[PDB]
Design a protein around this nucleic acid. Structure first.
Ligand code: NA
Ligand code: NA
Length: 327
DNA sequence: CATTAGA
DNA sequence: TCTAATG
């Protein structure tokens, strides 16, 4: 956590680099397990050798450990950091739409800068057009103060269209968070669950609603169960307009909400942990259900969930307010 | 890890 | 169809 730090940090820098600038999935994956393992290690790694005894700890990495140990640096690290090309890839990637693959290809052609990107908005697809457009607003944090604003409105039309809908705004937002990156609406309806062959409209109707009023301003992607877009809070009585916000709304069988909700609310640690517990407690937890464990090794049969509680109760735990789902 | 664009 | 990008 801090004794293993530099090494893990360097190693991660290292993986990441292969993965993006290069297309070295393997090495990348090498750097990572190592980074994983050296990380677990209970002692100060004092040399490559010591490190090396580890699993996944090859000669190439160990070698890298020494140089890092001896001098507070690493050439290859220094070299890459410098690399205008590699820098370019890292950068372009921030555009929402742009991944490593496109990142390379773009560079290839010579689009390294934002400006470049613009000059060639044609080379870009709708997703990346928008990504490009709201580049600033997309990088910006979301004050909870706004979160409430957005949350508010959302619930309004939701109910507006059909009183029957149920939306929850999952994430850190839900976990008290002074700020969030994007809003996550989990949605369901009773007229939709596990079997009941959809009602795509269900998603549709609302998106439409949200748009109708001007909350939704752009569609990044809309499928029959996962809408991915942009939104914005009415710019008041002028002088102050709102940043374009990332928004995602997903449909869900009313028969899987709570777990889903449970789940997407986190935190990542709380989940894991809770999850780990449900195991002792003879269960199985996952994004959609909760199954009773059978001795043979495994088992099925999704226990019925009406609220975040049911799940709790099931595993017989203390209902934890989202507030304190921190871990 | 599953869902959507796209080509 | 596969292959990329999101989360
Ligand atoms: Na080894
Ligand atoms: Na990106």
């Amino acid at each position: 956590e801090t004794l293993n730090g530099g090494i893990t940090d360097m190693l991660t820098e290292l993986a990441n680099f292969e993965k993006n600038v290069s297309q070295a999935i393997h090495k990348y994956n090498a750097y990572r397990k190592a980074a994983s393992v050296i990380a677990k290690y209970p002692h100060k790694i004092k040399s490559g050798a010591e490190a090396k005894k580890l699993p996944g700890v090859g000669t190439k990495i160990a070698e890298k450990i020494d140089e890092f140990l001896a001098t507070g640096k690493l050439r290859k690290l220094e070299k890459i950091r410098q690399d205008d090309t590699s820098s370019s890839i890292n950068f372009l990637t921030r555009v929402s739409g742009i991944g490593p693959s496109a990142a390379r290809k773009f560079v290839d052609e010579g689009i390294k800068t934002l400006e470049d990107l613009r000059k060639n908005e044609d080379k870009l697809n709708h997703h990346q057009r928008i990504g490009l457009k709201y580049f600033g607003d997309f990088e910006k944090r979301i004050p909870r103060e706004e979160m409430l604003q957005m949350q508010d409105i959302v619930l309004n039309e939701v109910k507006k269209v059909d009183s029957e809908y149920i939306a929850t705004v999952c994430g850190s937002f839900r976990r008290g968070a002074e700020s969030s990156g994007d809003m996550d609406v989990l949605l369901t309806h009773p007229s939709f669950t596990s079997e009941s062959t959809k009602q795509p409209k269900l998603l549709h109707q609302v998106v439409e609603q949200l748009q109708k009023v001007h909350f939704i301003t752009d569609t990044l992607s809309k499928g029959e169960t996962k809408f991915m877009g942009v939104c914005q809070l009415p710019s008041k009585n002028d002088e102050k307009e709102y940043p374009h916000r990332r928004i995602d709304i997903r449909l869900i069988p009313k028969d899987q909400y709570y777990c889903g909700v449970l789940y997407f609310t986190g935190s990542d640690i709380f989940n894991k942990n809770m999850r780990a517990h449900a195991l002792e407690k003879g269960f199985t937890i996952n994004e959609y259900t909760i199954r009773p464990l059978g001795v043979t090794g495994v088992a099925g049969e999704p226990l019925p969930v009406d609220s975040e509680k049911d799940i709790f109760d099931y595993i017989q735990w203390k209902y934890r307010e989202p507030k304190d789902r921190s871990e």
